[PDB]
Write an enzyme that holds these catalytic residues in place. Structure first.
Site, mmCIF file in Angstrom:
data_model
loop_
_atom_site.group_PDB
_atom_site.id
_atom_site.type_symbol
_atom_site.label_atom_id
_atom_site.label_comp_id
_atom_site.label_asym_id
_atom_site.label_seq_id
_atom_site.Cartn_x
_atom_site.Cartn_y
_atom_site.Cartn_z
ATOM 1 N N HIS A 1 0.806 -1.243 0.000
ATOM 2 C CA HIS A 1 0.000 0.000 0.000
ATOM 3 C C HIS A 1 0.839 1.295 0.000
ATOM 4 O O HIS A 1 0.661 2.220 -0.848
ATOM 5 C CB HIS A 1 -0.980 0.009 1.170
ATOM 6 C CG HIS A 1 -2.380 -0.360 0.795
ATOM 7 N ND1 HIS A 1 -3.037 0.187 -0.285
ATOM 8 C CD2 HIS A 1 -3.266 -1.192 1.392
ATOM 9 C CE1 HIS A 1 -4.263 -0.304 -0.345
ATOM 10 N NE2 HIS A 1 -4.422 -1.149 0.655
ATOM 11 N N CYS B 1 -6.575 -6.452 2.455
ATOM 12 C CA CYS B 1 -7.825 -6.111 3.114
ATOM 13 C C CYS B 1 -8.942 -6.843 2.429
ATOM 14 O O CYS B 1 -10.022 -7.041 2.979
ATOM 15 C CB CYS B 1 -8.060 -4.604 3.073
ATOM 16 S SG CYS B 1 -6.508 -3.730 3.455
#
Ligand SMILES: Cc1cc2nc3c(=O)[nH]c(=O)nc-3n(C[C@H](O)[C@H](O)[C@H](O)COP(=O)(O)OP(=O)(O)OC[C@H]3O[C@@H](n4cnc5c(N)ncnc54)[C@H](O)[C@@H]3O)c2cc1C
Ligand SMILES: Cc1cc2nc3c(=O)[nH]c(=O)nc-3n(C[C@H](O)[C@H](O)[C@H](O)COP(=O)(O)OP(=O)(O)OC[C@H]3O[C@@H](n4cnc5c(N)ncnc54)[C@H](O)[C@@H]3O)c2cc1C
Ligand SMILES: Nc1ncnc2c1ncn2[C@@H]1O[C@H](COP(=O)(O)OP(=O)(O)O)[C@@H](O)[C@H]1O
Ligand SMILES: Nc1ncnc2c1ncn2[C@@H]1O[C@H](COP(=O)(O)OP(=O)(O)O)[C@@H](O)[C@H]1O
Lengths: 449, 451
Positions: free
Chosen positions: B10, B42
């Protein structure tokens, strides 16, 4: 101390309850000219649409004469206040059954007389086939008259006419929707939003007659025809007027300070220009935050908050009004449409120079088994970059996002704030940056050039 | 100028893209020890639960070596940074396919090395029937291998463990969920919320084994037995470890200022204590607004924000971090659970004195054809009345209301602000006062009575 409350729907009901709660030394009298109090007008379209529990309008009342009377209020229905004389702290009130009029003193007066529907001075408004849509008795009349109609004409495509048109079309009435603007909800949402709605109206068989005001009604046979300025003649069994409201404040015209439409101007504690007369709700102006000015925004949200503040500030200036942002919304044919603050139509009408970005994005990732496009607008000041308004629309219920933008506006947050403020991520809800963050980032990119 | 990014999920992906967009003179090399970059961890519970499109985890990648290369980055996968020497501005890098090591210079170094799974020296934790759940390769292994199992044990009932228990319980595996706390999501939600979740787990066949930590694993035949301190022996085909993460930050231990757990402390522009070394994501501490101090909140939201700030601030101190509120959420068995800011469990751990109200209301009026209860909590400072945290749960998706509260915390708004701030009313959505207004009013009533 003697407190008189004039009118008892949203603002007056809250003012009475909060007054009694905080001031046990208050002997309260409520005068209401109707035969009912505490009715939720904001449920009328769902009631007429046959979409409330058991189609029972009793469930739309949030109080009653017995409840208020047991709090210790003297509730006088079918009583009309006919004079207010601020200088002597008196009113005159008429018992509408006996015609008996009495003058009486007060210590504090609470003007929660609301608004009346705007009825244009044109032929046919006296027809029994023309209906208003404001209160309980209006609602009952419409609900009772339904079995005798197959075609309804709705005049005015503001929030109320938009909802009624949807409500009747979903029951397979033939619906005509007539407005002087060239778009439905013209003042309320950008074209990119109302184009979607118009498409849904036409797909559900709604005849949109847009661009010319109604000039007249004519009752002929068992029908009325609605006639525009540009020559159209539209037949239906009944017609419903939904062209707005005006402050019901004739009692205080020339006696307290007002906007041009009669809305009572108040300080931050809800006092009018006379200290012992408070105003709240559709009788009153609101402090509108986006332009730091007084405005007329007749919404239940403002009635309950203003009513609360009257009770809070009855004897002492204790709690300042935070003002408002005109946050509002609707759900039509399953699509949510919400807005807060200023839009580009209202900015053009008030010669405000603003910027706006309009973007569309799926609210959550495409790898999910379902997602929906959210159409978004953000309106901001070109120089300060402060957010002045926004709007969202989706098949997903994004309504709570207008509350996020309302809080941004309340705190005068900028597009840069919105772009980065912490918002939760989980793929069931959003992308890593929430769609509101993405909106802020789009505004930043526009502003930076 | 020479920019080296260490780690590329990320924070590193955002740092690379933002850096290149804002700094045409940046010459970017990205080192990643794994064989893939830019995967959305996620999404793993939804992938494993067969709730993504075509059950295809390629749809969870938000970038690619090709994409970053086309932007001008030199992407070097299967390369591990093994040394960082601020005194020479060099790093050492091992090629993991060939074992060769080379040293190179940097002008700027961006530490986006994230977190590594916590694995204590519990006997047997080494077994081939014990699975981790952090990244793409972990997820792929579970997707391949879980269908061979009838019974899955999940160790740890934080956010990941709770999600995994739900995902597997809906595919009709037998599922055990074990945690040392007496309640699932103990750290994250009040009992009033977690009692609801527990009964939902139970009603979908999940065996909750709460109150005692795992002490040992033993592999017997083709099974694994998980043994708690209190004497329970839980048999399964596989076990998945979900007992948290810690900063992956050994390269800079003793070299830059860190929290006790290794999180790299940064200033408002994402610089470490060494001006030319930035940190972003799970390698870094956040500025936590509710306590106005540094904390470790390892969330994707922080990774994307901090990565963006690295790129914005690479050469000039241009944009200050606004900090964060720990806003997070789950949807489990159709029920939304969201939180922002501090909770009472966290305050009690750090000796913080707070007040809290908890109420429940239907989110919209009872005359509607349907409505749902929304359970709500608000935490606030008893002296200033400032909002410090809140939580909501409902079968209706009230998630965006946690973001309303986040923006209140950002602005140090009080319970009194929340009680009256303008929010919309339409009976399809809410009551004349929104449930959040009603929440603030409840907090006001509590605060006023207590003096
Ligand atoms: C169909 C409809 C749908 C709506 N939808 C929404 C919505 O979804 N959301 C939203 O926020 N708002 C909505 N609104 C607006 C909202 O209903 C009004 O803002 C709100 O009702 C105003 O409340 P009030 O108490 O100020 O005034 P009113 O509701 O106008 O009540 C005023 C009362 O005063 C009494 N009165 C007046 N003069 C006298 C007098 N001289 N003597 C004695 N009594 C007197 C009247 O009989 C009346 O009972 C809608 C309005 C309508 C009509
Ligand atoms: C299963 C799961 C579910 C989650 N759910 C959510 C959620 O719903 N919402 C949310 O906000 N957050 C969630 N999180 C947390 C979120 O994924 C993390 O905060 C985020 O992935 C951290 O991003 P990062 O770039 O900081 O670190 P990481 O993703 O840990 O990546 C760091 C990278 O550095 C590489 N690396 C490390 N050391 C070296 C080295 N020496 N040399 C070269 N490369 C190196 C690693 O291989 C890795 O690819 C979840 C996490 C997991 C595991
Ligand atoms: N004579 C008329 N004929 C047709 N439309 C009219 C006429 N007078 C006003 N309108 C329309 O009615 C609408 C006014 O409703 P508005 O007050 O804005 O919303 P709401 O009544 O739901 O609060 C406007 O769209 C305006 O164009
Ligand atoms: N030995 C253990 N046995 C059972 N549970 C454990 C053990 N060690 C840690 N845990 C639990 O693992 C959970 C880890 O969750 P946490 O780190 O807070 O969230 P996350 O899902 O992001 O990793 C905690 O509830 C903790 O009680």
């Amino acid at each position: 101390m003697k407190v008189i409350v004039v009118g008892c729907t949203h603002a007056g009901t809250f003012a009475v309850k909060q007054t009694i709660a905080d001031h046990p030394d208050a002997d309260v009298t409520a005068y209401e000219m109707n035969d009912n109090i505490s009715f939720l007008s904001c449920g009328i379209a769902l009631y007429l649409g046959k979409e409330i529990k058991n189609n029972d309008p009793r469930g739309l009342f949030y109080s009653s004469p017995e409840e208020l009377s047991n709090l210790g209020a003297n509730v006088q229905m079918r009583h009309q206040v006919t004079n207010v004389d601020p200088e002597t702290k008196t009113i005159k009130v008429k018992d509408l059954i006996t015609n008996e009029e009495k003058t009486e003193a007060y210590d504090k007066l609470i003007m929660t007389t609301g608004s009346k529907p705007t009825v244009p001075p044109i032929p046919g408004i006296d027809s029994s086939r023309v209906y208003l849509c404001k209160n309980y008795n209006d609602a009952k009349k419409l609900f009772e008259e339904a079995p005798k109609a197959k075609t309804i004409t709705i005049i005015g495509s503001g929030y109320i006419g938009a909802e009624l048109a949807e409500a009747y079309s979903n029951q397979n009435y033939n619906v005509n929707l007539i407005d002087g603007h060239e778009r439905v909800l013209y003042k309320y949402f950008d074209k990119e939003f109302t184009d979607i709605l118009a498409k849904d109206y036409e797909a559900h068989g709604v005849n949109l007659v847009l661009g010319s005001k109604v000039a007249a009604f004519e009752e002929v046979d068992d029908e009325i025809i609605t006639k525009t300025l540009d020559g159209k003649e539209i037949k239906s069994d009944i017609a419903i007027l939904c062209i707005g409201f005006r402050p019901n404040t004739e009692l205080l015209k020339g006696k307290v300070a007002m906007l041009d439409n009669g809305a009572i101007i108040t300080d931050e504690y809800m006092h009018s220009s006379n200290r012992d007369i408070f105003a709240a709700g559709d009788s009153a102006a609101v402090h509108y935050n986006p332009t730091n000015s007084n405005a007329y925004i007749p919404l239940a949200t403002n009635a309950v908050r203003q009513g609360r503040l009257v009770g809070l500030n009855l004897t002492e200036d204790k709690v300042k009004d935070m003002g408002t942002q005109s946050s509002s919304g609707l759900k039509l044919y399953g699509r949510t449409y919400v807005s807060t603050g200023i839009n580009t139509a209202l900015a053009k009408a008030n010669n405000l120079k603003v910027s706006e970005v309009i973007i569309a994005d799926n609210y959550r990732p495409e790898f999910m088994l379902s997602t929906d496009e959210v159409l978004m607008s953000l309106v901001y000041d070109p120089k300060t970059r402060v957010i002045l308004g926004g709007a969202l629309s989706s098949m997903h219920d994004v309504s709570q996002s207008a509350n996020v933008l309302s809080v941004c506006i309340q705190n005068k947050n900028t597009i840069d704030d919105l772009a980065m403020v912490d918002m939760l991520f989980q793929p069931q809800f959003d992308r890593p940056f929430n769609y509101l963050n993405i909106l802020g980032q789009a505004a930043q990119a526009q502003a930076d050039k």
